[PDB]
Amino acid sequence: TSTVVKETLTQLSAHRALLTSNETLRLPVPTHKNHQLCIGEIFQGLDILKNQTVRGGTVERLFQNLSLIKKYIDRQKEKCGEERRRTRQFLDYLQEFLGVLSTEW
Amino acid sequence: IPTSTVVKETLTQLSAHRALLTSNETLRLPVPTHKNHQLCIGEIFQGLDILKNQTVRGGTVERLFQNLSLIKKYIDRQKEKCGEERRRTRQFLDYLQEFLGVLSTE
């Protein structure tokens, strides 16, 4: 899933009037730009958006694509605790998590 | 308040307690296959926890454990800030577009 992203971004733009058409719908919007932290809310709002948007159009194109991206990230997430290693290499990982967190705000 | 340079102190204590912490060699802890830390916060602090529960307690290492505990809470609060504010669809779509936008960097 490499630039099925640029296709997903083009489909989004091109279906903005349709999706934007419900003005009653309120969805979760993170207060910040740590997107990775908020994947649950992003994809569950996307979900509500779907069960209320009229189906079958060329939006299906958008919807399967995001579905793919969702899958990708369900896999990324399994990759978090699937491998157990030794305490050195876990410390290493925490060290460098901690090292990038100095900038994450 | 946002933990700022409690990060460097945590970094310094980590290093300084690496002999003790790495002293159990039978211990196997979850380590993420990739560097997308924030998608993995759960697994990070579950491993830290297992590690705690068999590191001997009371030492200078408590410093290190309250420090991460502090960071944990700050992230528990970032995570509550995901769904706390509900806005309208275009500002949701804005945030989606720009999430997808930094996702092409891989």
Domain boundaries, chain A: 1-105
Per CB-CB distance under 8 Å, the chain B contacts of A84 are 28-31
- The answer to whether B11 contacts A99, with C-beta atoms less than 8 Å apart, is yes
A30, A36, A81: residue with CB nearest B30: A81
Method: X-ray
Which SS3 state, helix, strand or coil, does residue A44 take? helix
Q: Hey, what CATH topology would domain A1-105 get?
A: Growth Hormone; Chain: A; (1.20.1250)
Phi-psi region of A56 (alpha: psi -120 to 50; beta: other; left: phi over 0): left
Domain B1-106: give its CATH architecture.
Up-down Bundle (1.20)
**Is the Cβ pair A37, B42 closer than 8 Å?**
no
Candidates B29, B96, B106; nearest CB to A85: B29
Look at B22 and A88 and tell me if their CB atoms are within 8 Å: yes
Whether B30 sits inside 8 A of A90 (CB atoms) is yes
- HSE-up (13 A, CA, CB side) for residue A14: 13
**Interchain proximity A12–B82, CB inside 8 Å:** no
C-alpha to C-alpha distance for A67 and B61, rounded to whole angstroms: 44
Q: Is B85 on the interface with A (CB under 8 A)?
A: yes
Residue whose tokens read 């349709």: A18
Q: Is some CB atom of chain A closer than 8 A to the CB atom of B95?
A: yes
CA distance A13 to chain B (A): 9
For B64-103, what is the HEC assignment?
Answer: HHHHHHHHHHHHHHHHHCCCCCEEEHHHHHHHHHHHHHCC
Which residue is associated with the tokens 């159009």? Answer: A57
B58 touches chain A (CB under 8 A): no
Name every chain B residue with its beta carbon within 8 A of the beta carbon of A45.
92
Helices B41-52 and A87-101, axial angle in degrees (round to 10): 130
Separation CA B15–CA A26 (nearest Å) = 46
Resolution of this entry in Å? 2.5
- Which H helix or E strand runs over B35? none
Question: How would you classify the pairing of strands A26-28 and B86-88?
Answer: antiparallel
